Amino acid sequence: MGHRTLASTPALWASIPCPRSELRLDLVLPSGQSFRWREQSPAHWSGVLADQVWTLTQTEEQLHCTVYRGDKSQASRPTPDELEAVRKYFQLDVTLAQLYHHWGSVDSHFQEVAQKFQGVRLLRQDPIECLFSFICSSNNNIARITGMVERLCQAFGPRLIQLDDVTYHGFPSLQALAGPEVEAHLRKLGLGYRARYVSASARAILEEQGGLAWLQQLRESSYEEAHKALCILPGVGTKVADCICLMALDKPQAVPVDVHMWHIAQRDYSWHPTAKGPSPQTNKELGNFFRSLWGPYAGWAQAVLFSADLRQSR
Numbered sequence: 001m002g003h004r005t006l007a008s009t010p011a012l013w014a015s016i017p018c019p020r021s022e023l024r025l026d027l028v029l030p031s032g033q034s035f036r037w038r039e040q041s042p043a044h045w046s047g048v049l050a051d052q053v054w055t056l057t058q059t060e061e062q063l064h065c066t067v068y069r070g071d072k073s074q075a076s077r078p079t080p081d082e083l084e085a086v087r088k089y090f091q092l093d094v095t096l097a098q099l100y101h102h103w104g105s106v107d108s109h110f111q112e113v114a115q116k117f118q119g120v121r122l123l124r125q126d127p128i129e130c131l132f133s134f135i136c137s138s139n140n141n142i143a144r145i146t147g148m149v150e151r152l153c154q155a156f157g158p159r160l161i162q163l164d165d166v167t168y169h170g171f172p173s174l175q176a177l178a179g180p181e182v183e184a185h186l187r188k189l190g191l192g193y194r195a196r197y198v199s200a201s202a203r204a205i206l207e208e209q210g211g212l213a214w215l216q217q218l219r220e221s222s223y224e225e226a227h228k229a230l231c232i233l234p235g236v237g238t239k240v241a242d243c244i245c246l247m248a249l250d251k252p253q254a255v256p257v258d259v260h261m262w263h264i265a266q267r268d269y270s271w272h273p274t275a276k277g278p279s280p281q282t283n284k285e286l287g288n289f290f291r292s293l294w295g296p297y298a299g300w301a302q303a304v305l306f307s308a309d310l311r312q313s314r
């Protein structure tokens with residue numbers, strides 16, 4: 001079985017109405033939200049959504065989707081149900097045009113970046129995948145996070161399918177990551193101190209917080225409650241808790257502050273603390289600065305600027 005292109009198997013592609021103004025796969029899938037997507041052919045992005053492999057590509061007005069099923073069933077277009085899982089993952093019910101207008105109307109620098117970086121949306125990620133991917137993100141570059149997440153899934157996620165050279169795994173279950181061998185094994189895969197954070201956080205969610213049920217509860221809770229609750233987990237500080245809140249728990253006002261948002265603040269917003277250096281208090285101020293500027297979807301605005309900085313550094 002090989003990776004499909006819109007050309008190589010036209011009958012196996014289904015279409016979502018979706019202009020490039022609303023979504024640019026090339027500016028979203030490698031922009032450090034999800035670490036699971038690869039451009040395996042020019043303009044074709046392959047990765048795992050909900051334990052199935054997809055390839056996505058786009059024309060001017062359409063998002064084209066194809067799904068590989070690891071069963072013995074005949075190949076077929078995505079069902080309307082499967083298509084809806086893609087629509088929710090890209091949060092296409094949120095119209096980017098109105099947000100881009102608001103952010104540009106209050107912020108000249110954003111206006112400037114936004115011209116070049118259209119269609120940068122926030123993915124709605126699975127909370128487990130989002131939590132453990134960003135535990136892997138601490139003191140780490142995008143290349144090394146992608147590698148660490150890839151090795152974690154290979155080791156502890158179910159094998160789905162092989163396409164050309166690439167073997168795809170689902171994201172590990174809590175049960176898999178709570179296992180007794182996990183920590184040692186993750187240290188062998190170069191996760192370092194993060195190996196223990198993964199094991200201990202999987203055990204803390206299963207044993208103390210009542211499993212997956214908890215992350216659904218946080219999804220339905222306030223930003224303030226969700227952020228506080230996440231911060232009890234080993235390896236989850238303010239930055240990682242904000243990433244999870246923004247990317248998996250529907251808190252669009254979350255502004256994850258680390259060195260990267262500091263660099264944008266100083267370089268592009270001539271910003272200083274009101275200790276001149278990254279601390280809890282100065283990190284909190286910076287987050288409040290961008291919520292005050294951009295409004296209730298501040299974290300979506302940040303995603304645009306992060307997409308730009310990531311692209312313009314390789």
Ligand SMILES: O=C(Nc1ccc(I)cc1)N1CCC(n2c(=O)[nH]c3c(Br)cccc32)CC1
Pocket residue numbers: 031032033137140141142143145243246256260299300302303306309310313
């Ligand atoms: O912080 C995130 N992701 C993230 C994406 C969107 C939102 I909103 C919030 C966080 N992580 C993945 C990207 C990673 N990173 C680099 O390695 N270089 C970066 C540059 Br240049 C600039 C911004 C991040 C960078 C840091 C860890």
